[model samples]
Target chain A: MILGIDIGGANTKITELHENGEFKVHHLYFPMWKNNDKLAEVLKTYSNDVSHVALVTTAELADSYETKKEGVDNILNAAESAFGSNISVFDSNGNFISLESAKTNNMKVSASNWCGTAKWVSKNIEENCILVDMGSTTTDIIPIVEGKVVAEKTDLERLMNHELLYVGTLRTPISHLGNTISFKGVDTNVSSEYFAITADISVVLEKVTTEEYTCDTPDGKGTDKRSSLVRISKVLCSDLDQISEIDAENIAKNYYELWKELILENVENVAEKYGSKKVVITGLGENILKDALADFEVISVAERYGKDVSLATPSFAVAELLKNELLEHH
Target chain B: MILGIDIGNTKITELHENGEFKVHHLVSHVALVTTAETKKEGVDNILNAAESAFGSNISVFDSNGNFISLESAKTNNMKVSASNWCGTAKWVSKNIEENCILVDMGSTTTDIIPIVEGKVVAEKTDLERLMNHELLYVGTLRTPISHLGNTISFKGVDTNVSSEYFAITADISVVLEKVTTEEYTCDTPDGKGTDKRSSLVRISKVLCSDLDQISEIDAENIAKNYYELWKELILENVENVAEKYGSKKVVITGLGENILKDALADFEVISVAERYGKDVSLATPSFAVAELLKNELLEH
Candidate 1:
């Protein structure tokens, strides 16, 4: 059995692949900031359960490049110490194995995954379609030719790297927009005001849940008050009294505006010069970007790709491609 | 008719104590923050309304030190330009009239002014309370709980400086059952933690939310948490402010909720020394010192 472990900022997702290529998924959460001694204990338990191991780091790593490397090193060191020589850590975008290729074989055969987007591009008088996958933490904007991912500078790169965009779902911090917002009528400051986030809004809308997905909220780590207002307030040089409700509403609105702008800029920057192509927006932030790209036909990956489209996720697409290349040799 | 104006950080509160002061019992909220040209406009609307009702020489007494001092000073420059010296501002404690004392209590600080016959006299506790109100920053489980710069710590080592020991308001209220259920869930360090009743129980190692109120399970737990997180901010600031006032007849008010009074039991000397020369006085000082001012209002 081969265990594929993906470490996120808050959750560790472990996928166990058997000798027969069957896989099982196990998930656990930890407050990674405060290395509660129990972190080692929990990993040891998982290691004992798995016969072999392969670990991967995901978007949940630290924001800074240096910290990301340190964390990756730490995870590998910890897993190696726990599992002895049997455990191996791989980069998030690890090489393909035959068993993994088998899973993606079905995905490559389907056209509906990018169907909704492909049709929109063709009808909008475009020569090519670009798949823009915006996830929490980062964004992957990949160009596609005839429904397949086209390699950019590197020819043999997987589908995700061809256009892997990391802007995402439940993960973007609200402070990325900023404080002292001007909206509607008044220009007011905000309280370390703790309103809801996109994740909270999504939670309210029931788009995600604790059962189907692991939430980022690290519950019960003491001595730090990390609310939207608190996080937003650290950037401020003023007092709470200076803030108003309208300011908060304006800030959220501006946040949406900036996020949409970034998505649109990335898409426009990558469009081929000779081609009139409409961008195919995918992932959780798609609804927020629809109105942002009003000039172009904004089609969803689900609409283009169709239902039962496993390649909706960038990781799945990359996983499918690596598997295909590995299996073709067999 | 008298007008009682309160200038708060978030909003400007104005209480019009109309004929017979019947409006005293009713609490009204005119929520206006410092924004746009509304400050000047608001003061104008208020002053004009008061002038039409009471005629000229609008006796404007407040908790300020001078008759010209206004609680909402940011709007005063705007109001002064508009009214053009038409009105007078009085100290809230100083008695231009004999009936009212304006107690300005907001989020960060609280002030009590004694108005005796429309003259401004500094209450002993006011100066002491203001100065002594230290930076004990723990509230309803919201802001940073970590110890930032400590008065007692030297090179990550301990010192003889007075450490903060008071529980946060959240700890006090949460234990006393005074807090709503919604107030309990706070953020975790990982930027994703919300501790509701269930999470608190899991984290704090406590079994139930219905712990004893005063010195019982809940109150004690909250008191303990406050001592750990917020003790330094309050004690150092309060002590600093109190020392300048010298032993005065200290009266407590605002969001303390009896818990602050209990916390100040060790400092009885600070309050009683002003009234009775080294003799500990007042068996129990109540939090509703504002109510005592009302008695003087009724006698006149």
Candidate 2:
């Protein structure tokens, strides 16, 4: 069995792939910023029985570490202790590197999860589609053409190219959706603080259930629709008594609309560059780009490999990639 | 001579109850570093910090528009914390007989107090002022540009802004020509130089880009877009207070005085900076308490 570990800034995903093509996915909400020291313990328990471990990371940009170099070094130090000599890390080039190379080449290994997903698509599925892997904090928009991952490597360059849309479904604060949102004929500036997130809006619209609300609430309040409405009301710096429930819902609907437009604008930009209308979607926001890209060919990773596996695609991809590479080498 | 002190979250403005009012502040998050975690530690540290410098004749303003001696503050420390706005309001109230709203546009927070008949009539506490529409957590400097909005228009592209404190209101104000590099007394986000080009680079970082990835004009627009969105936030608050108290007259001071003045076009407006001077107006709270203490000292 080979274990793939993708440690993110907010969540950690692990995958165990067997010799006969069976796999299992495990997910944990580990805040790397707060509990960065505990990752080695987590890796020990999650991949105890495995002799081979594959690693990728997006937690290098967390504010807990002063710089990406610090985050990568610290995280890999933890991974090194847990997996010992049995680990190979996925690099930005979509190939496996030994643990020592991964440490010295920290810049290439930082935030390299998109490479894993695109490589998986390149080896398994059609390679011409734009891979839209929308995770909790950010959405990775990678363009693959003819079984080659051709998008930019670093997030800074990807952001410049419109391939890394920073807005996401769960952890994105509604403040980032836009500055001004029109509600009931009155346009108001959204409060810039994390008064509420896109998750609250999703919960209110019933796209995300109370059970599916995995992150912490802004007010430490409940995860119900009413709590979401109150959170949404705070975006305007108003309260439930000042802004009616109807107005709050209008605010939610409007911000949700704006969120869709943000994604649609970038996806269309990437598709235009790649000359591919097909979008291979994965992760929790699988259907977010579905309705907006109605004219294009939209493929679902969830439909092929259950919902949890789709959400954990980075780890799943790295595990299988590790398997194929080691087998070929032997 | 009594030294009137306003212990704001970012900077401390001190005034000696005399005409020669000077300006200085500690470059610390008084919310974290300067202010002690407990009242006993805070009071003793403050008492030691102040008495060693200015002698024991120090009067700090409490939330109730009353002067806080070290003894009084040691008992009612909660009243003395975050009451910097009260002194500014009390000082502004002396000149107005009719209902006048005092707007102190601070660096990190804006205080809007509704005064009637020369009385400090607004809610005295920060929690109460926030509960009412009298206080806004928006300002012209030290306020994080990320708090201005999440997405800013860069080169006419509606881009998602990074939420990290990559830039501050000081950079935006510098780019917009609202403040000079010397006037921008706060620390830069990245500890870079305080020049216009340096400020431009900081503004570009708010959009997660550098000046290399964008034009200088587009970077300035990023600053403008942040300021433009910031323009929409204050009037909603001022109008709410104006409507509730039926006051159309506004007395403005502090760093954000123009921000309030720009928003209050229709209302009767007054500038303490214009009437008194820039230094007194910027440190209105501390200066007011010192001036108020001067009045009390005359009897003795």
Candidate 3:
């Protein structure tokens, strides 16, 4: 069994790929900036089920250029200490394997091959293409040509230089960005007021996976697309003009447009840099971006994997891609 | 009008003496451990009638010796910020010619005054005499003393000695006469348990002053006798100075039976002391000291 651990700034995603290729996902979230013990304990508990673990790095750990390397080193060191065997640590793309060469043969991937980006790109084009995986915390804009990832790995230097913009759509904390936002014709400075992030926007758009996604949100029945859209947008605005049924529809419409404009700009910028081409988009955010990029060849990951896209597991696709595509090519 | 203020640690007594030397005595009692201002304010308010009658009044620090002068300085310092100027500051013993020296002995002090020229010289010698002539800084008895000495002496001995915290010999004086009950205990050995006055087996529950005049009683006179005996201890320190340059007729004034007894026994060449003293004297410092010195000494 190979366990792929993807740890973000505030969340740890652990997916176990059994010998039978069945994947079970477990998520533990806390402020990763706080301590190592929390992330270490979450990873340590899955040691038995994990024969080989590949730790993937996210921009959340990018404090400095040197810190990206150091953060990755910490994850691998901790995972290996718990597993007491080979533990491979990789970048956001989850391929350029480090420390655990033993796990390399079993997986095929690259530094830019995000499961979302891979799925998004596979269905897009045979010519110059771009794969964009824009999620709650960040937007990953990868350019692809001849169905291969072309954008360089995001390092501290690039992020600091604004080559890789850290801004995102939806539930990003106000502190991460800036205060005050303009909407419609009103130039209003936001109060020390709480505003929901793009994650809330994504939630309203039915972009979150219910099963593997653990939120501290209140649980009940009717958590479907309509409910997600309603709940997500409710957290966004401070006040509701009315509680009429019509207001729900208005919020969804307003939020969709708001998010679309954001992801569209990110995709367009990367798309224009690579000479303006249609791209494949995946992840929970894929459909949203696909809607925004209607004129372009917006495709999903399931089609490229040649399986049911809805049933496709993101980590498995990432694993299979590692085994069949990049490993073989490299 | 002249106001004689006998400011002692234990009590404040006001003697309103007119220009004719007629006195109308008024007293406000309080414990000695209180702040000086507390006593002053009480005296000020109580003397309101006389102040109105006199229209102007002089302030006097009367006791024996020049102790009242230092006390005046201290009180003036406390009242420096007061709204009015002092009318007068006088010493009775220093102004009385041919009068007895008076020494008023209280809980922790024994004051000696010499009468001379009809005005008190208010000299520095008397001030030094008050400070050095007595085994001062020692309590009557049963007074708590410090446990720690500042430093030890070269004779392999501790330079500072502790005063007994048991009931004083004056207290014992009253006790032997059945004047005051042995109600309180002594603060002994610095933080050790309190020792009762009855434990000394000499307490008669009499007033401390009464015990001084008694010979034998149900209570032991150790605390009382010890306190009175301290007067002799003080007089020995001042006898030479009182007869300095061979002045034969030395008068003493003040109050303290035990203190005067010792002084008279030692210096029979004296002129007078006080009502409490054996010889005839006035209970005034300036007048008493003034009479004894006469025109022999210079005034300040």
Candidate 4:
């Protein structure tokens, strides 16, 4: 069995690829900031007779590590302690490097987890495509050309180009999206406070059901529509009594429209530049993407590879890529 | 004697516009948005410098451009969010009657206001001005280096600046020799003294480098690149306001006049000091408000 792990700032996921072509994926809320030291114990519980392992992460960007080098070192050490001597780390260049090599070029492996999924899609799907993966905190718009991952290789370059957007579906503060929001036919400037998040907007728009809200809300309230609406109204520095629920819903709808507008703006730019007509949408915000890009030929990873596997696409991608590597070596 | 007080975001000045026209200034570590208590405390400090120069009713022009009565200001519970743009605007309107753009690049924020037919015909609110690009957040001293540009060429290599507040625009000004130690009155990030070497070290850290990693010449080049980028930001805002107003003439004021002059080299620019003289320009806004009050009370 090959074990693949994706450690994020707020959550950790583990996927297993059995020799019989069976797949098992499990995820737990393992926040690296709170308990990064317990990574080995958590990894041991998921790995059942693991023969080889692959690792990819965005946890290096977490505050747990003072610098990217320290983040890489701590994560590599945890992986080494869990599954010693038979593990590799993924790099943004679409190549897996040894534990020793990963340390030498740490920036390449920092936040390189998306490259694993993009690489898998490039190899599996023989088409010109843009991998539109909208996760909880960030979105990746990777371009694949003729069965090859041919786009910006580094995070800095990807961010400079519109290939990477810092805004996401769940955790992004609404204030960062835009300075002004329309309310009751008036464009009111939003307070620069952490009053509500994008997850509240998603809940208000019914883009994600209350149960689908995996992250915590700003006020620590329930993820029900009423609670979400109240939080969204607070973005305008108003309460439910001051702003009607219908008006609040309109505000949420405006945010939804604004988010979609931004995503579409970037997606069209990427499509024009790469000539990639097909878009493979994956990650937690897949439903939002479906409606956001209804005009395009959209393919959901859930439809292609069951809903669970779609949710854990990056973990599954690493598992498959590692399995291929083991077979090629033998 | 009538007292004309200018309470800026980072500094406070009180000009006794009488007799010898004595002046007193001090640096306070306050910001653009400050508490009512802090504003009161700042006002007290300015009065200390004024000695017995303060009149029975002191005139004030705050950073946010509010001209509140001292009693009304004390009673208001909310923070005084007024900016100093009104002070510069008051001064500009007094000296020049022509329609022009007022460029005041201070420590924290830059204000580009459009004057039309001897009146400030621009947006009144800060939020509206920011939306219209009349207010660009980029400033000479206090703005973070990361806010200037995404990437900068360091040591002839393209490098991304860390978005963390490791260094500020003051470091950039210090590196380019645009500002001296006396001019940089704001507190340093590391809490070190604001000197030339300290600034060089801070600017070096913006590129994730230090004096040990790079030579002083390389550090100076990094500062030069940052200077050019900061200049471009101000120039862009100037072009934005000037284009909207269809006026080429610009009146530059504030401590950042030298920096703006260099940036607005191609435009028809004149310094406030060059037109009105240095003493008047230093205390332009305060003098403008004092003169306005004198004209009102005496005429009535």
Candidate 5:
């Protein structure tokens, strides 16, 4: 059996792939900054009886580490202790390296989890298509051409090429979206505060369920529809009493439209740059991308791979990639 | 006569309270270098410039909007950041009776202050101001050209801007002829000269190209593109302040008033230099500190 792990800044996801081609996916809301020292115990709990381990991480960019070198070392050390020395770290080139090599080439492993997803989908996709993975904290728009990943290799390069947008579905603050929003047919300026997040907008639009709001709420209140409405109203500096439910719902709808516009602009730009009209949308924010890229033929990863695997796509990708690489070696 | 002083991140300006007020500018690099030896050296440089023009019984204001006694400021070697905006706000309160937005574009940063009913109601801390878009880390001269925007158009192609501090805003201002070479007194990107040609070369390097890669006309277009982008930034901040304050009245001041006025042409802008005189506009903060000190003494 092999274990695949995707460590995020806010959460850590794990998947176990058996030799018989069966798998199980699980996740925990483990903030790397707070529980970095205890990461091994958490990993051991999920990755029991696993002989081989494959890992990809975005937690290395967390604030806990002063440098990427430190972040990579910490994660690898935790993994080394938890699963012993038989481990492979995922790199941006769609290959896995030994734990020792990962440390020396820290930049290659830093935030390279998305590479697994892109490579896995690209292998299945023969034609030119854009891989749009919209997670809670960020969105990755990777271009695939001729069954190969052809996007920029580094985060800075991807950011420059419009392949990486820091804006995301759940955790992104409304302030980062835009300066102004419409309220009651009037354009109102948004307060630059952590009053609400994109998750509230998704919840109001019924794209995200209350139980699926895996991240913490801004107000520490319930993640139900009523709390989401209150949170969305705060974006315009109003309360539920001051703004009617209909008005707040309209305001949330406006945010949904704004988010679509933001994502569509980049989707079109990347599509035009790479001449790829087909978009394979996946991750938690897949529904958002489906509507945004309605002009193009959008493929949902959930439909291709089951729902259990799609929610934890990166883990599944790393596991599947490891499975193929291991089979080829034998 | 009272002396008003405004010490900024890049430069320090001093002037008399009134009557043929002399304005002398010095680089703030001395104070910024916080070695014990350099602190006294910076203090002496500023004091010598002030004492030569006006007597020693002087009142001072720090750039972060705080008033300090000359003795305390000299002895403690106070930071000058807390004083400039205080002076600008004071001047606005005395001059403009209506609710107005104060757009002071200096060498290192732009201050988008909102005055409501003769009282300044904007965020006070630098971090808060930056979060609210009231303190744009962009100005006329000292700001790096790369900080203008992520991508810039060059040779009819959209190119990503190199994240190198290879060019300063003064280079673009010089290329546009918006400000004279003399006004660009800050350090050049290459630590060479601040001539027009040097400024042009620095601006060219923003796109990772040299003088040969782009001609003078091509550089002008690139600089114009940057200037327009900077204009949009200021406009964005102005709109944010306006939306919050519900006031469209703007008051433009500081060394980069020309850029501010041109950027804010649509708004009902009141140019301090045009309303008052060139000397008054340059010395408004100095004048403001003196007047505020007098009012303080009178109340005591």
Candidate 6:
């Protein structure tokens, strides 16, 4: 089995690909940004019967590593510590570059997970489609034209190019999109420190389950609706007293709707630019594509592939690509 | 020796109750969301260090207006840990006007401890006080300048401020002559001097600009703009607390007395600095709490 690993800042996803096309997926809800030291130990857990490791990661953008070069260097170093030498690095151009090549051209390998997903997206899903892979911390809007990744290679360029959205499943602070949301026909200021995140909103609105809210809570408390309501109420700089539970729930629903529109707007904008009418949505935020329900021909990776594979889609995609690479070499 | 320890978000205060004038304000790096164990460890560290200087076995003061032991301080951490302001108000209620809104604007946080009939009438915990408008999570020298307003007006033009810690309340104070460059007793944003030039440079960065980019006059105007808005928040909080307590008087203390006095100028204002002196005004909470504990020790 060749191991495919997609190391995100909030979660480490691994897909084990057996030669017979059978696959198994594992998830570790690890916050790599805060716990970068534990990645080597985490990787060792998935190191059973592994012929080789095919690695792609967005964990490098995690704030722990100051620069992309350092992030690439250290993450690559951690991979080496766990899997030893037999590892192939995936680049944004959709090639498994050598480890030394990845080290020297470090920035190229930092956010290569989206690119590997694009390769499988094109190879299996569709050659020309808009891939909205929304994970815990970010949403990647990849525009593929003629089986090549047409989106800007770097996350920075992708952001400027309107191909990357930094908001996604669990980590987006409500302050990021909340200018002033309405409750009972009034707009109120969302104030103070990081009082609530998208996870709380998702939980309060029942857009996700408690088991699905794998990320850390803003208040370091319970993940129940009551606790989530209190967290959301803090966005108004109030508790349940100042704002009722209904108000908090309404605010949570509004933010959820607001983010969906934002994602829809960017997706529509990107679709217009690329002239790609098909929408391939996956990852934790695949349900965000419900807005694209009417116009574009939307496809679900979870419906096609398994949900576990869909959740860690990049790792699965990279694994298949690595299997193909092994065949090409043979 | 009796130690009056004030555990704040960014800073800590330890004052001697009886001996010659002595107090030390320490820079704390503990997070507000720190777990109970971490908070206990922080208290233990402060108490152990304090006992090293002031000796062992000291009474702890909390927002409950009661003397808590080191063990109780650790146990009732939420009510007792961040209650330095409550201790200050309890003292002021006893000594100063019994019915007044006590506004203590320290370097890190502003406390609106409402006193009625010689008792703290504000909400219980810091989180509760923040909601009740009795505790504004911003103060002189410490808060990010962006907290004043997202977009600050300059020369009648609305320009957005950077969300970075580019500038802080201390820079605004120094730039607007609210605090002397020498009186800016805090670490600067740029780790630069607290001089007028350094302050101007920092205030310029609030607009994501350099001092060289904006005129010196423009820099001062922006700080003045931030000052008015910051004052508005405090004034609103003061009036809100005032309305609830029905107290027309606001007794002001701490480093931000000038701003508080100016903000509550409409209301009858009393200055602790004028009454007691600048030293007591700066560390009023630590000082007042020490006196309260000393009385307790003597009574017992």
Pick by lDDT: which candidate is best?
2
Q: Model 3: DockQ against the native? A: 0.00
Per-residue lDDT tens digits for candidate 5, residues A115-139, read 8888888775545799999887678
Docking class of 3: incorrect
User: What is the Cα-based lDDT of residue B241 in candidate 5?
Assistant: 82
Per-residue lDDT tens digits of candidate 5, residues B1-300? Answer: 444455543233333345444545441111111111455577757655655555555555554445565556667665533535656786587657449988887777778888888888777655356556677767788876655654677666665554445787888888777788888878897887777788777777665567785688877788889899889878988988898789889998877888898789879999888976665565566555655655665576
**For candidate 6, lDDT tens digit of each residue in A1-330?**
889888776678888888787889987776654535687887776556565889987564322636767667777888877777778988766778888888889878865557778888888779999998887767778898998778864443454456776567787767555444666664443454567888887777666679898878887999999999999888666788876888889888887877787677778878988888998888876665555334789888988887788788888988888887778877
Task: Tell me the tens digit of each residue's lDDT in model 2 across B1-300.
Answer: 344466544344444434655655541101111212466676566656765656556665655666655556656656555455666677677643347888877666777789887887786544346656676767777877866766666666666666556788888777877766787887788888888899999888776678787789988888888887776667777788889888888888887776677777778888888987787777666667666766655558
Residues A1-330, model 2: lDDT tens digits: 888889887778888888888888987777755635678777777456777898888564433646666667777888877878778988767778888998888888864667788898877777788998886668888899998888875555676677888776688877667656775564444445568987898889876568878889989999999999999888777788876899889889888888888888888999998899888888777767665566778888889877878878989988878877888877
Estimate, for each residue in A75-98, the C-alpha lDDT of model 1 and write its tens digit: 545665567555433322233323
Query: Residue by residue across B1-300, what tens digits does model 6's lDDT show?
Result: 444445552233333434454556551111111111465666666556555544446566554676666556556555445554766787888888899998888776778888989888887644456557777766788776766665567656554344445688899888878888887877887789998888888887666567666789988998888788888888887887788779998889989998898788899989999987787787776677666765666686
Tens-digit lDDT string for candidate 3 (A1-330): 666566655666666666565656666775544556777777677676655565554433323334444455555556666877655555444344556552333223223325433543453344467766554434556666666666654332223222243334443433223222333332212211123444444554465555423333322334344554445333323233423334444444564674465556656766777785766655555656677878777666545543223222344444444444334555
Selected candidate, larger lDDT, 2 vs 5: 2
Superposed model 5: Cα runs more than 4 Å off: A19-22, A28-37, A42-48, A62-74, A82-85, A99-108, A125-127, A181-194, A212-242, A306-308, B1-227, B233-259, B265-269, B273-300
N/CA/C clash count, model 6: 1
Say which docking band candidate 4 falls in. Answer: incorrect
TM-score per candidate, chains pooled: 0.35, 0.66, 0.38, 0.68, 0.59, 0.57
Residue A107 error, candidate 2, Å: 5.2
- Tell me the deviation in Å of residue B251 in model 2: 8.1
> Regarding DockQ, does 1 or 3 come out ahead?
1
Model 3 has how many clashing residue pairs? 87
For B103-168, candidate 3 gives per-residue lDDT tens digits of 444333434444444433322322233333321222233322111111112122212111112233
Preferred candidate (DockQ higher): 2 or 3? 2
Worst lDDT 10-window in candidate 4 chain A: A58-67
DockQ score of candidate 4? Answer: 0.07
Error of 4 at A198 (Å): 6.3
Listed for each candidate, the true contacts retained, as a fraction, are 0.00, 0.20, 0.00, 0.00, 0.01, 0.01
